[PDB]
Amino acid sequence: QLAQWASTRFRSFKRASNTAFYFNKDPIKESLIEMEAELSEEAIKNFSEIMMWMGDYPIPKGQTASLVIQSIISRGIENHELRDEIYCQAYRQTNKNPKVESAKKGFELIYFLSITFSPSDSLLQPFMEQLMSRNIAIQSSSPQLASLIAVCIEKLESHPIPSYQQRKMGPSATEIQSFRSNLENGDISTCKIRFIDQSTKLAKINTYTTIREITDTVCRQYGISQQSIKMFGISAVNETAGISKVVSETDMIYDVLARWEQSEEKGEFYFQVRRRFFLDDVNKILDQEHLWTDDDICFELTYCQIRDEWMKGLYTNVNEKDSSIIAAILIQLLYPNQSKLVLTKEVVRQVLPDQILNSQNIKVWISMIESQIFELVSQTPEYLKLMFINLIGSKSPLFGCTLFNIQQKENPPKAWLAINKKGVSIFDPHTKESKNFWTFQSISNVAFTDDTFCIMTGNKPIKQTFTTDEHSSIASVYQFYSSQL
C-alpha cells in the first residue's frame, strides 16, 4: 500500500520512464518525495537531524538528542507540506538497519511524530498498514521492538487529535526518558510541584497533561478547598537567575519542559504553586474575614506568600511609619505573648526587607517599631495576619497584580505588565512606580502575536503595544479578571 502511494509521489518511482525504502549511512542529496527545491533543501537538513537522533550522524558540541528531535518535530509542526517527507525519512531509516539500537530510535521518532501531527490523509492508511506488517513480521522474534511499533499504530489511530490537545513542542530529555522507562518497566511518570513552605507534591503526568490539570491535583492533595483551587496557579521559579514566571494553565506541561531545555538562563527551574488571583476587596478584609479565613489552608498559603514577597522587597513604596507598623505586626506573629521582648537588630532583620531597611539606620527603626508594638500584643495570630494583609493591600499598588516582564518603546524600555481585578498597568521595575493604568472598561479589545501583547484604548482606538513572549499566560490572566466584571 505504501509502495503504491509512493509510486506517483517519490522521486525514484517518478524517474521511471523501490530501493528508496531501505536504510543508508549516507545523508540524502535530495528529498524522497518530489517537491519544490525550497522544501527539498529543508528535507535534506531534516534527514541529517533524523540521523543525529538515531546515532548515525554526530551531534555538535552545544546540542543534545532531545534538542535534535525537538527541531524535527518543530519543522513538521510549522512546515505542514514537509510532514509526509518526515514520516517517510524516519521509516526508511528503520527498514534494513545494521544496528538494532538505531532502528529502535527510528521507531521512537515515529512515536513522537505520531503524538504531535498526523501524516496526510493519503499517507495515513498505507503508512499504518506498513507498520502493522512490520509488527506482525517481528512480533515473535523481537516482542520489545513490536510493543514500540504497536504504540506508534495506536497513536496514529488516535488522529484527529482535538485542537486543545495538540502539542506545540517536541519531547524534552525528561519526556524521552519517561517514555523509555514506561515501555520497559511500566512505571508512572510524575512531576514534582513545590509550595511556598518548600513542601512538595507529585502529580501523575501524561503526554497531554495541562498545567491546569496538575494545579488542580496538587492543590486538592494539599487540602485547598474546591472553590479556592481556581485562585491558584503555577510559576516557573529559577532561584539562581531571579525568575518567577507565570505558567499558562492552558499550556501542556511537556511543552513547558521542552522550552526549559531551550533556556540559556543558567541554574535550574522548578514549578511552584502560588495564589494567582485576588478577587475580594482587601480594603474590607477586616470586616469580611470569612472570605479569607474560611479555607485555613488557602489563608495560610496566602499569608506566607504575601509575607515572603514583603521580605524579598516586592512592596517597597510603603512609607516608614507603615513599615514600622508592618514590622510590629510580624514581630507579634514571631514572638506571640512576649510583651517584655527587647527589640534587637536581629529581630528587625526578620521582619523588614533590606530595600526598606536601607532608608534609615536600624537604631531609628528599633525606636519607630517600639512605638507601634503595645496595641498589637493583645491581638490573635489570625487577626494580625489579616492586619498585615490589610496594610500591604491598601498601601501597595503591586498587591493583587499578576506581573509579566515586557519590552517597551516608552520609558522604561524594560518594564512590568501588571494585571489585577481593576485592569492593566505598567510599572517601572526599579522605582516600582505605576507609569500607566487602564481599567478593563477603558480597553475595547486586546490582541496577541508570538512576541507581542496589545491593548486598544478609546475609541478608532489608540493602540498600546508591548513586546512579550508570554501571550498564553497574559490571555489567561486577562480573561480570568476581565470576565468577572
Curated annotation (Swiss-Prot):
Residues 23-180 form the MyTH4 domain. Residues 189-484 form the FERM domain. The keyword ATP-binding applies. It is found in: Cytoplasm. It comes from the Eukaryota. GO terms for biological process: actin filament organization; actin filament-based movement; cell morphogenesis; cell-substrate adhesion; endocytosis; filopodium assembly; phagocytosis; spore germination. Keywords: Actin-binding, ATP-binding, Coiled coil, Cytoplasm, Motor protein, Myosin, Nucleotide-binding, Repeat, SH3 domain. GO terms for molecular function: actin binding; actin filament binding; ATP binding; cytoskeletal motor activity; microfilament motor activity; microtubule binding. Its main location: cytoplasm. One of its GO terms (cellular component) is cytosol. Monomer. Interacts with talA. Myosins are actin-based motor molecules with ATPase activity. Involved in the early steps of phagocytosis and adhesion. Belongs to the TRAFAC class myosin-kinesin ATPase superfamily. Myosin family. The coiled-coil and the proline-rich region are responsible to the binding to talA. This is Myosin-I heavy chain. The chain holds residues 1855 to 2357 of 2357 of the full protein.
